Design a protein around this ligand. Structure first.
Ligand SMILES: O=C(CC(F)(F)F)N1CCNCC1
Length: 152
């Protein structure tokens, strides 16, 4: 059948919101009130991949945009990028591996591990207004835990 998708927002465990701030750029900052309209709405697709009770393979598209979070090597490192696709062909159930995250539920928080690069996670910095990135440890100063708000 089709691929199933839900609209949602993400906030890091510091309670920073995510916003589209430049061509292919997502930023984490503290947001409340009117400015909350600026936050990015995701279409989270439930995709093909290895699955267990608390580990669910997803793709993260931007709502009604042909843009997906993806994990690729750049200048020889696992990095997070926003990648454009053919809007006729996406989303699909069999997303290419660079688009797949393992959504992991631990202690009432979510982590998003790269399917392509084991133990690399969607991360934010403690500082305001810095890029969302792929970080090679769910330990230390960078933030790898999120919560998920469901959107109409
Ligand atoms: O924000 C990103 C990647 C993203 F979060 F959008 F996926 N950056 C910063 C701008 N250049 C690409 C890497």
């Amino acid at each position: 059948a089709p691929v199933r998708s839900l609209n949602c927002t993400l906030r890091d465990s510091q309670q920073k919101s995510l916003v589209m701030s430049g061509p292919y750029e997502l930023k984490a900052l503290h947001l409340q009130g009117q400015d909350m309209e600026q936050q990015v709405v995701f279409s989270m697709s439930f995709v093909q991949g290895e699955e267990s009770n608390d580990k669910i393979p997803v793709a993260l598209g931007l709502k009604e945009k042909n843009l997906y979070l993806s994990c690729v090597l750049k200048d020889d490192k696992p990095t997070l990028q926003l990648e454009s696709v053919d809007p006729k062909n996406y989303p699909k159930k069999k997303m290419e591996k660079r688009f797949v995250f393992n959504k992991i539920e631990i202690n009432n928080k979510l982590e998003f591990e790269s399917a392509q690069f084991p133990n690399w996670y969607i991360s934010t910095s403690q500082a305001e207004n810095m890029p969302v990135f792929l970080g090679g440890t769910k330990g230390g100063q960078d933030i790898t835990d999120f919560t998920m708000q469901f959107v109409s």
